[PDB]
Curated annotation (Swiss-Prot), chain A:
Covered residues, full protein: 60 to 105 of 105
Lineage: Eukaryota, Fungi, Dikarya, Ascomycota, Saccharomycotina
Misc. comment: Present with 200 molecules/cell in log phase SD medium.
Described purpose of this protein according to its UniProt entry: Component of the mitochondrial ribosome (mitoribosome), a dedicated translation machinery responsible for the synthesis of mitochondrial genome-encoded proteins, including at least some of the essential transmembrane subunits of the mitochondrial respiratory chain. The mitoribosomes are attached to the mitochondrial inner membrane and translation products are cotranslationally integrated into the membrane.
Assembly description: Component of the mitochondrial large ribosomal subunit (mt-LSU). Mature yeast 74S mitochondrial ribosomes consist of a small (37S) and a large (54S) subunit. The 37S small subunit contains a 15S ribosomal RNA (15S mt-rRNA) and 34 different proteins. The 54S large subunit contains a 21S rRNA (21S mt-rRNA) and 46 different proteins.
UniProt name for this protein: Large ribosomal subunit protein bL34m
Transmembrane feature ranges: none
Regions annotated as coiled coil: none
Protein's cellular compartments: Mitochondrion
Family the UniProt entry places it in: Belongs to the bacterial ribosomal protein bL34 family.
Swiss-Prot record, chain B:
Subunit structure and binding partners: Component of the mitochondrial large ribosomal subunit (mt-LSU). Mature yeast 74S mitochondrial ribosomes consist of a small (37S) and a large (54S) subunit. The 37S small subunit contains a 15S ribosomal RNA (15S mt-rRNA) and 34 different proteins. The 54S large subunit contains a 21S rRNA (21S mt-rRNA) and 46 different proteins. uL2m has a Na/K ligand binding site.
Cellular localization per UniProt: Mitochondrion
Phenotype upon changing H139Q: Causes a cold-sensitive respiratory growth defect. Does not impair assembly of the ribosomal subunit
Miscellaneous: Present with 1600 molecules/cell in log phase SD medium.
Comp. bias intervals (Basic and acidic residues): 177-184
Entry superkingdom: Eukaryota
Chain intervals with Basic residues compositional bias: 165-176
Protein known as: Large ribosomal subunit protein uL2m
Similarity-based family: Belongs to the universal ribosomal protein uL2 family.
Source organism: Saccharomyces cerevisiae (strain ATCC 204508 / S288c) (Baker's yeast)
Length: 46, 184
RNA sequence: UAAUCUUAUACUUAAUUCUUAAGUAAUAUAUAAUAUAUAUAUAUAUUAUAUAUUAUAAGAGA
RNA sequence: UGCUGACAUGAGUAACGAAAAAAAGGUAUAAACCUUUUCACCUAAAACAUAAGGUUUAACUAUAAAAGUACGGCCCCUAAUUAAAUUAAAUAUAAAUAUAUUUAAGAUGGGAUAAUCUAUAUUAAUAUUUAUCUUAAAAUAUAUAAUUAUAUUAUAUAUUAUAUAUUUAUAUAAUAUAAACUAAUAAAGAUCAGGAAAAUUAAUGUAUACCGUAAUGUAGACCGACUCAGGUAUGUAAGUAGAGAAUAUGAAGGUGAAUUAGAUAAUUAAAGGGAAGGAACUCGGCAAAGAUAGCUCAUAAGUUAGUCAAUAAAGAGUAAUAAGAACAAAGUUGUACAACUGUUUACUAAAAACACCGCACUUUGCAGAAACGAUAAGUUUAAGUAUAAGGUGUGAACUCUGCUCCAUGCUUAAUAUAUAAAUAAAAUUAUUUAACGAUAAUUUAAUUAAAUUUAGGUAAAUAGCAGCCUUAUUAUGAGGGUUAUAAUGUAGCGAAAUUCCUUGGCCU
RNA sequence: UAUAUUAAUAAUGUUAUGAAUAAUUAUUAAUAAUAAUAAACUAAGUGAACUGAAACAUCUAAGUAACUUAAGGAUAAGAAAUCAACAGAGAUAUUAUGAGUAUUGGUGAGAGAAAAUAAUAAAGGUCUAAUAAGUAUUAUGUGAAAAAAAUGUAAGAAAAUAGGAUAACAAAUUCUAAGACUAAAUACUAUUAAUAAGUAUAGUAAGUACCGUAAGGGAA
RNA sequence: AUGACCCACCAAU
RNA sequence: GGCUACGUAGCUCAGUUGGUAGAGCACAUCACUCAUAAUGAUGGGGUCACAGGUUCGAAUCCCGUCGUAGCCACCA
């Protein structure tokens, strides 16, 4: 069993979990977004 | 036990039928394997099943393979009625509750022998890992070199004693039980 | 046991709708009291009176 | 082993990541690019379609053309599930929030019509798996009021002739192949009992949205830090062979690669062959070697009766007689341990560990035992109800499971039994006052808990299970004697994975 | 689907024995929606651990970090039931001094006021309440290391002839709880201005490249 | 002659 | 090997928290019996295994030898 390939992309899943709207919808995600904005981040979410 | 296809069963909860009213007089026919009646009509001693608890409530006792309860006594005034449940416990049940004459079916589920671990999974029973097999962090019986019981009293993964320890105790006990079930 | 407590399941004014009131009506709970009376009791029914417009049902119960 | 940067050394060293190349010409420039030709490798694929993913990697900027029928999305509807949503007072909660209900979301699934092409709109009403056997029937030989015979066996199509309608229409009979495989069908076996959710005609419409569309997808175009022998979903997948998608080949297709050219010392890897031996090797037959159909027969002991054993082993026929593809096929027996089929240390341990089926114990009556729950509501247990659920030990079955509650717990009953908080009281107290009074302390009557103690019970709870001496001429020790315990190791079994001495004595 | 709807009308327009039915278009009326908006400071709820104690449990760390909520330009406090002491002072706040002092502490580590005196500071006093009870108090479990006020449970007053304050008590003294408001001096941000024995590694790029599935990290 | 030995007792219908 | 308990009347077992010169059984001597054996009634033996030491007095005690199950068990 060879490791290394732990990332296994699937756009839909990514957008569900780490997408902007998911962040927006949760309180915790909204807080994250705010924190990133404060930092100065160009890209707040996937 | 013997309700095979093509038989007629009745329900007397809503008062004896206005049919048998027109025609002791018929109590013989009244108590027949499978017909429902408020215990207030059951002859004391009749093996029953689907025993209830409240006069306006569903059957909630002896409803399993081979289970059979018995109307032990019928306090006519209090409105309750001592009954012997499968465990052997004499509990008060509202004299006007639902109980059905008849030992439940599958009187041999007590002989079935799922003989392959597969059969258990189809049924829905994932494997039980023994406390003695575990590590100490996981279960009190765990740890030790070789196989050991750690001088630890037989108990659950959360420290509740497994052998003999009465779990329903003190103030929070059953109010309606007349005589407790036979033990050991 | 109306302490706790479980479970289950019309209309007239006034201020399309809604709320208040009054008037009656209606239901029901009884009361006032009679009816026809029977085994000092009473089936009731009654005009009339009280007075309503979370209940009820089941279980537990100071 | 300071940090950043630069640059050294190893060193022009190792390596250039499974491989088949040649030539001729593009192009008096080409190992490496294109073209042609030869050769080769992959072929139930290195092929052709695709899914997902992605620096567009493409046959590219003059670019991946869709009203719908073997187009998908979008859309309609739901599953698992999610949700600053939902419902004087939905319930619960340091806040956060959580729960329950509603409601809206959620494809991996469902979803109308259609090549003799097709019309979705508005309005009025009113299907777990698995099988396709038998038998019977129709048919060609027999033989020709037979028995055999072996094949046929539900479906789909054109043709011919009719027949009904008038050259469509449809019915009707007529001939018409082997193997697969497929779709609609029917009838049918088991236990493990097999999703959800979204009307009808009739009338009237319908000037057809958007979005994916390349190439890549067993990989140089995604994941693996690399153009990385790893990982990566699906249908196809010439023929000839065969039981088969096995194995050989390979028509067509697609490849021949960011190292070549020589050389082939020692030496290493990967192979082939090997005289006479024949496990002498060695920790140990590790590795390698070994196959006298693969079909059809035939197949023991034992045993839980299961061709389990067993694909038995050997042996046999079909083929073969010097031998003359690949591929499946690799002996037997004793012992320890585990019943089994399984599980486990992803990256050193696959077992003698785990699991298991069975067995027992034990809790819990259901407004329940268990578990979770800053802690609740509440949830799972279960739309289950003691033949259930939870816990616990042992781990199929045979033959069997002896003794003890000491300890420790559990359990039961005792007004045995200490004590904690909680009271009206009023009193000695003090201290203060001028006394009144006030503020403390302190006793003292009332109804004492659980607990412990103590007595049961409970060891398939947790646990535990003697010594000495002496004895039938010697030996042994039935017997005998003492003592001691809560009980005193019982039946098995025994130098065991348990044996120190110990390479125990004896046997093979 | 507000280039909508509901109309009403205007007109070409239809089924229809003008006439009631609609089809546009056109007017007019009337009917709706339109959250990106900071961070810091402040207040409140909850509330650590390391560490200190040369260990360590009390204690510290520390009501700090952290998480939650909410408010404003600030907020908080604020006009005495305060202190004091036989004299007296007169809201609150910040600073100095008092003072590391009284007090306090496994009397260890350690923690630590106030009065008073000055600074700063603004107009700094002023009705808003028909005067404050389940409150004063008390008992009890807690409770800013000193210094108390609060709070769960429950008992529970009194009218100025009163009530708070001091183990207690007696004197005396002071003040009015259970109703209120309050600039300014302050925190923070941003800006302008001025000064820099500050910065060219604190001198403009970049939260970019890039690493990570993600929060997050983070260049030159 | 044969011919060294013999051993058990407990309480009623 | 300093290092825990045990060395008894022939046999077994004593005794305990001192206030000490026990038990049966075996043996000898009677008896009982026809003769045994049981049963019965009569006597036997402790240096309570050796040193030394204490309260008034240790089987007991302290104080350790000649004696009884013994002691190996941080290995990479």
């Amino acid at each position: 069993k060879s490791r290394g390939n732990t990332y296994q992309p699937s756009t839909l899943k990514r957008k569900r979990t780490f997408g902007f709207l998911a962040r927006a919808k949760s309180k915790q995600g909204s807080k994250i977004l705010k924190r990133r904005k404060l930092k100065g981040r160009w890209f707040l979410s996937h | 036990d013997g309700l095979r296809p093509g038989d007629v069963v009745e329900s007397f909860r809503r008062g004896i039928p206005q049919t048998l009213l027109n025609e002791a007089i018929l109590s013989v026919k009244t108590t027949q394997r499978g017909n429902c009646l408020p215990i207030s009509m059951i002859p004391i001693g009749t093996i029953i099943h689907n025993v209830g608890i409240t006069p306006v409530g569903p059957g909630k006792f002896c409803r399993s393979a081979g289970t059979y309860a018995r109307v032990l006594a019928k306090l006519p005034e209090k409105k309750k009625a001592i009954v012997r449940l499968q465990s052997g416990e004499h509990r008060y049940v509202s004299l006007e509750a639902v109980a059905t004459i008849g030992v439940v079916s599958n009187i041999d589920h007590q002989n079935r022998s799922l003989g392959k671990a597969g059969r258990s999974r189809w049924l829905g029973i994932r494997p039980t890992v023994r406390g003695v097999a575990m590590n100490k962090c996981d279960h009190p019986h765990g740890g030790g070199r070789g196989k050991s019981k750690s001088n630890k009293l037989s108990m659950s993964p959360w420290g509740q004693l497994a052998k003999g320890y009465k779990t329903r105790r003190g103030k929070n006990q059953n109010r309606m039980k007349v005589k407790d079930r036979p033990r050991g």
